[PDB]
Design a protein around this ligand. Structure first.
Ligand SMILES: [K+]
Length: 379
């Protein structure tokens, strides 16, 4: 049922010159993996990104962005580093927290992956609010136009638009996957730490682009909560689905990011209990209707173990919610647990629904396609 994408203490990567990366797992393996992101192409190719936390599960550690590629439906995986940290600080240099998009960008099928980058900061990003933006921070974007075989840096204006805004200390993608709108626009959900003088520490929003090079921020902000979030497109709205301690939150914007209001079909529908957790939210067509599929943890121990990572369906018309599958019905590792990413496509007449998720320091994959008739009914 499950394949292992990245095995904790079981992978060996090489650096840009071809020398092994000696981590702290047994045998000099990478110690721990976190924060999976999955994007599936029109060829059926699955690409899974994750933090390769070579030494420890801590966010403040030495991390590269690994990529695993499967062309056999998730049975086997070719693994490499997609994004290397800057190798300034052997304890702290890091590229982390991926969000991916698969899109047709002016005709060219592209996988985008966006990650935050730090070097010398020894604390989490909320501790750095004095500058607009933090000098240790960056937000980097890589692309593949060869079906996930090679990734190259994209030169963007993302750092510039954050500086121009003047009230953002640091920004990340929302974690998991972004989207391409029906009209072609590329949209990354984002999370941001505001400068100190702003009363709200965290906000959610999005960045958008036509070409993947020049990006824009909307003028408005959504309340931050636990800030990790995903966006779906539903009629003339963009709708988010945000981490929060307890009940997850969901807002809609009808003016392309100027204002946000609660979205009743998803707001407060799933309980992740203490601390909250990242969750993945996507749409699945059913005739000319849509259903939202969502994954996050039931968290039966009400703590950082984030047990029982589960798939839900949200009826976007009636607001009903139901549990479809508790696909990881296990207590997680409190060093870092609970995260997931869904991926749906219809390629020709073949519909696929896949998930990746955190499993005791490893990243696992499941093919959840057998659940599609149940999800699609929920309209
Ligand atoms: K964190």
């Amino acid at each position: 049922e499950k394949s292992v994408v990245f095995k904790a203490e079981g992978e060996h990567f090489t650096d840009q010159k071809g020398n092994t990366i000696v981590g702290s797992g047994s045998g000099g393996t990478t110690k721990y993996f976190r924060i999976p992101a999955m994007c599936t192409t029109s060829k059926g190719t699955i690409v899974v990104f994750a933090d390769a936390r070579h030494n420890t599960a801590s966010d403040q550690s030495f991390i590269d962005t690994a990529a695993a590629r499967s062309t056999d439906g998730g049975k086997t995986w070719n693994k490499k580093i997609a994004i290397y940290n800057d190798r300034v600080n052997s304890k702290l240099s890091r590229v982390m927290d991926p969000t991916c998009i698969v899109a047709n960008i002016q005709g060219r099928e592209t996988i985008l992956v966006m990650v935050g980058k730090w070097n010398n900061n020894d604390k989490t990003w909320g501790a750095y609010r004095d500058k607009a933006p933090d000098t240790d921070w960056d937000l980097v974007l890589y692309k593949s136009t060869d079906d996930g075989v090679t990734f190259s840096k994209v030169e963007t204006n993302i750092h510039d638009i954050v500086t121009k805004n003047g009230t953002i200390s640091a920004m990340l993608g929302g974690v998991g996957s972004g989207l391409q709108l029906n009209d072609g626009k590329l949209v990354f959900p984002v999370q941001m730490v505001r400068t100190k003088n702003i009363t709200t520490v965290l906000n959610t929003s999005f960045i958008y682009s036509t070409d993947g090079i020049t990006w824009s921020l909307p003028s408005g902000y959504c309340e931050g909560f636990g800030s990790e979030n995903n966006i779906i497109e539903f009629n003339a709205s963009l709708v988010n689905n945000i981490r929060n301690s307890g009940l997850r939150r969901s807002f809609e914007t009808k003016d392309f990011g100027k204002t946000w209001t609660e979205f009743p079909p998803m707001d407060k529908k799933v309980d992740n209990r203490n601390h909250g957790v990242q969750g993945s939210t996507i749409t699945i067509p059913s005739g000319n209707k849509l259903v939202a599929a969502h994954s996050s943890a039931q968290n039966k121990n009400n703590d950082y173990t984030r047990s029982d990572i589960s798939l839900y369906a949200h009826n976007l018309y009636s607001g009903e919610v139901k549990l479809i599958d508790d696909f990881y019905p296990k207590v997680g590792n409190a060093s870092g647990a609970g995260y997931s990413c869904l991926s749906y496509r219809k390629n020709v007449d073949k519909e696929t629904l896949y998930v990746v998720y955190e499993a005791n320091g490893s990243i696992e994959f499941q093919d959840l396609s057998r659940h599609l008739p149940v999800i699609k009914s929920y309209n």
